Design an enzyme around this catalytic site. Structure first.
Site, mmCIF file in Angstrom:
data_model
loop_
_atom_site.group_PDB
_atom_site.id
_atom_site.type_symbol
_atom_site.label_atom_id
_atom_site.label_comp_id
_atom_site.label_asym_id
_atom_site.label_seq_id
_atom_site.Cartn_x
_atom_site.Cartn_y
_atom_site.Cartn_z
ATOM 1 N N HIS A 173 0.869 -1.216 0.000
ATOM 2 C CA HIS A 173 0.000 0.000 0.000
ATOM 3 C C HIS A 173 0.883 1.235 0.000
ATOM 4 C CE1 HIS A 173 -2.774 3.092 1.477
ATOM 5 N NE2 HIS A 173 -3.809 2.303 1.086
ATOM 6 N N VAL A 209 2.620 4.054 2.018
ATOM 7 C CA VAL A 209 1.903 4.992 2.929
ATOM 8 C C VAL A 209 0.993 4.176 3.828
ATOM 9 C CG1 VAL A 209 0.176 5.514 1.150
ATOM 10 C CG2 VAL A 209 0.582 7.150 2.996
ATOM 11 N N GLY A 259 -4.985 5.108 5.542
ATOM 12 C CA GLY A 259 -5.815 5.973 6.391
ATOM 13 C C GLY A 259 -6.884 5.164 7.108
ATOM 14 N N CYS A 260 -7.461 4.173 6.435
ATOM 15 C CA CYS A 260 -8.519 3.315 7.000
ATOM 16 C C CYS A 260 -8.028 2.626 8.264
ATOM 17 C CB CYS A 260 -9.021 2.302 5.993
ATOM 18 S SG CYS A 260 -7.801 1.027 5.550
ATOM 19 N N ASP A 272 -9.421 3.023 11.875
ATOM 20 C CA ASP A 272 -9.803 1.782 12.589
ATOM 21 C C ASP A 272 -9.259 1.808 14.020
ATOM 22 O OD1 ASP A 272 -11.479 -0.522 12.251
ATOM 23 O OD2 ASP A 272 -9.676 -1.635 13.032
#
Ligand SMILES: CCc1ccc(S(N)(=O)=O)cc1
Ligand SMILES: CCc1ccc(S(N)(=O)=O)cc1
Lengths: 169, 169
Positions: free
Chosen positions: B69, B75, B78-79, B83
């Site tokens: 990713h 990076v 963001g999820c 989370d």
């Protein structure tokens, strides 16, 4: 704008940078990839007349996230279903021919009102493009996640942008 | 309400169901666990006087999500930062002594305005409990994600609920 459906092998090529080209939008590789196929993509139609994606993820009990999330209580992480919706908006921007790396910028309201158990067969993502904007190229979209026909998540105002070779936050 | 800080070994015991007990809130195990330590937890104070968590994740270039990713553009998803904020609100409800399995129910506005690169040292989560409600036990919270001192994500109205042994969606 050319191909209107994508196989798992196409999405893996996308994850390597070989679908849209280096420096352009990429899907994650396993184990962050949460899509098996894009069944439908269009730049017209959808809820807002600005385009639509339909994508699918096959479910089986051996998917990695079931073992660790949670022990004795397997459930697909909601964050990964939400992530698939961001990744598809990024894929949309790349598919339109825009340059740059994808970054999620956020969402308006997210609701989880169901869950994906290891007995489920298929998760379906429905993405409605609401607007595309040109200092950054960005897209705003609404999305739903469904499992075996049943709607379980909704997201309003998914926002994804493209960052050229000079762009930082 | 007893212990006010938690080591990685405590969080792994939490992931096994051995901190709050079977059928009570669990953190994910690796590789979905996005927290190394809870530095501070309180049921008073915070922005709304209803409690606060501070938690940390050590960053190094070998974390699994950097490789996939994205390829050539590492990076932190963001999820996964989002989370961690849901997981900490779940941990809060379990820490207060409530029974049941955690489920994320959604969020109000999420904004990503920075990124976690493989050169970063530490991600910090700041969670402010806004309200706790009793048909389900649920919590509403605001949160920020910061990297090496710099705020990069915000979430308003994180919502997490607890599901007893009879609860379904
Ligand atoms: C234990 C609280 C909790 C439960 C489930 C999630 S999820 N499914 O990763 O969005 C997050 C947080
Ligand atoms: C390529 C679009 C994109 C980029 C980054 C993310 S993230 N970081 O998983 O929330 C999601 C989607």
């Amino acid at each position: 704008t050319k191909q209107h459906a994508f196989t798992r092998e196409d999405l893996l090529r996308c994850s390597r940078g070989e679908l849209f080209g280096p420096g352009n939008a990429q899907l994650p590789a396993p184990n962050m990839l949460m899509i098996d196929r894009i069944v439908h993509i269009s730049d017209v139609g959808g809820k807002y007349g600005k385009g639509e994606l339909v994508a699918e993820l096959d479910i089986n009990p051996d998917l990695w996230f079931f073992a660790c999330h949670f022990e004795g209580d397997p459930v697909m992480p909601g964050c990964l279903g939400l992530d698939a919706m961001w990744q598809l908006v990024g894929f949309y921007l790349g598919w339109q021919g825009n340059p740059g790396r994808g970054r999620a910028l956020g969402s308006g309201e997210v609701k989880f009102f169901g869950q994906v158990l290891p007995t489920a067969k298929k998760v379906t993502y429905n993405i409605h493009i609401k607007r595309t904007i040109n200092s950054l190229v960005l897209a705003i979209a609404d999305g739903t996640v469904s499992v075996d026909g049943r709607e379980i998540y909704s997201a309003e105002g998914l926002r994804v942008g493209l960052f050229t070779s000079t762009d930082s936050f």
